[PDB]
Amino acid sequence: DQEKGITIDISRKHYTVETLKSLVDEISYNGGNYVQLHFSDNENYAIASEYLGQSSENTNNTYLTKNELLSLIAYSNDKDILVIPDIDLPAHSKGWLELIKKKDVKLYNDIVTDYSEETLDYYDNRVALDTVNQLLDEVLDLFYQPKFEGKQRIVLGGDEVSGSEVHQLDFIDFMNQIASTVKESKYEPQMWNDSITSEGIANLDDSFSILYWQQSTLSSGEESLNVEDFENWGFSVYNYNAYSLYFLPSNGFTQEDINEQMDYMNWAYAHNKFFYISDYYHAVETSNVKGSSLTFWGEHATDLSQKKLLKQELPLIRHYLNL
Ligand SMILES: CC(=O)N[C@H]1CN2CC[C@H](O)[C@@H]2[C@@H](O)[C@@H]1O
Numbered sequence: 001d002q003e004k005g006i007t008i009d010i011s012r013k014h015y016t017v018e019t020l021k022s023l024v025d026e027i028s029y030n031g032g033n034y035v036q037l038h039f040s041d042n043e044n045y046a047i048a049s050e051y052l053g054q055s056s057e058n059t060n061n062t063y064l065t066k067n068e069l070l071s072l073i074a075y076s077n078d079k080d081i082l083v084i085p086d087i088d089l090p091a092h093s094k095g096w097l098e099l100i101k102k103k104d105v106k107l108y109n110d111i112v113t114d115y116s117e118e119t120l121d122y123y124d125n126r127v128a129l130d131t132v133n134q135l136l137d138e139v140l141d142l143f144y145q146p147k148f149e150g151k152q153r154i155v156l157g158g159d160e161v162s163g164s165e166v167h168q169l170d171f172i173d174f175m176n177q178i179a180s181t182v183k184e185s186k187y188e189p190q191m192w193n194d195s196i197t198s199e200g201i202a203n204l205d206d207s208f209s210i211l212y213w214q215q216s217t218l219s220s221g222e223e224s225l226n227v228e229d230f231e232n233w234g235f236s237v238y239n240y241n242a243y244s245l246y247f248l249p250s251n252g253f254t255q256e257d258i259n260e261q262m263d264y265m266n267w268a269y270a271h272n273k274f275f276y277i278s279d280y281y282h283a284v285e286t287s288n289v290k291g292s293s294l295t296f297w298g299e300h301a302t303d304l305s306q307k308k309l310l311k312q313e314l315p316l317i318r319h320y321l322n323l
Pocket of ligand 1: 299
């Protein structure tokens, strides 16, 4: 049984609760299993947070209200869709770090790396971990879904982490600590594949499942981890192929571009075709593949209305879910 899900970047682009419910409708209609809500990145923290100071119970341009988010989750569960929170750590963190800076600059200075305003200090910093863990505790409560008790998952990020290749055991220790936190709330942790190396794999909590979007290349020029490697160290993977299964909605696209994307998906997508350095659509014959996801990243969607976002995304959701 291979799962299929839709990942939605609501940090780079604003989505109303109605847009999101319409998208979930389409996921359910075509038998999709989950929706991954990527709500925390550099540009914005796009859900309500008592901890971070986003508490308005009024609809606004910056974050889903708590009531809106809970409504969305309940609507999803009623249609047998699991909602997977995605909070990106320790990089891709500028949006919530900027909120901490507002709340408490002393704390900000105690937890941000000295070189990157986008990156939480994962290099063995207890106050940084404690702060993260408080945020995670709020997120794990917010996304509680009793219908899926024992099956909940949370994406914890781990993509494009500066310093992670050199300082790999610190990165892995950090990821293991936040995995511990989510596992205490009976969530399965997940992370992207790209910043884990040969050096870290043996120390990484194999409770993690891996969102495998693009095989990395090490500073040596050597290939980084592939799906067989993950299998060999006890990790399950999901196919998030960066070419076949990424789409960036844009105001410059026409209907013809969406049709082309579907014709491209016809040949480029398969459940087990992963993005490897040698082959962008590499078929893997391992036993550790659990599913796939189409992801809508938000950074090109600047001038799109909500109606136009639906116009581009609905057909792509349907086409992917029926392939
Ligand atoms: C896991 C991942 O894809 N990470 C980044 C890189 N990808 C590549 C395609 C997008 O730019 C997207 C970007 O929005 C994401 O933040």
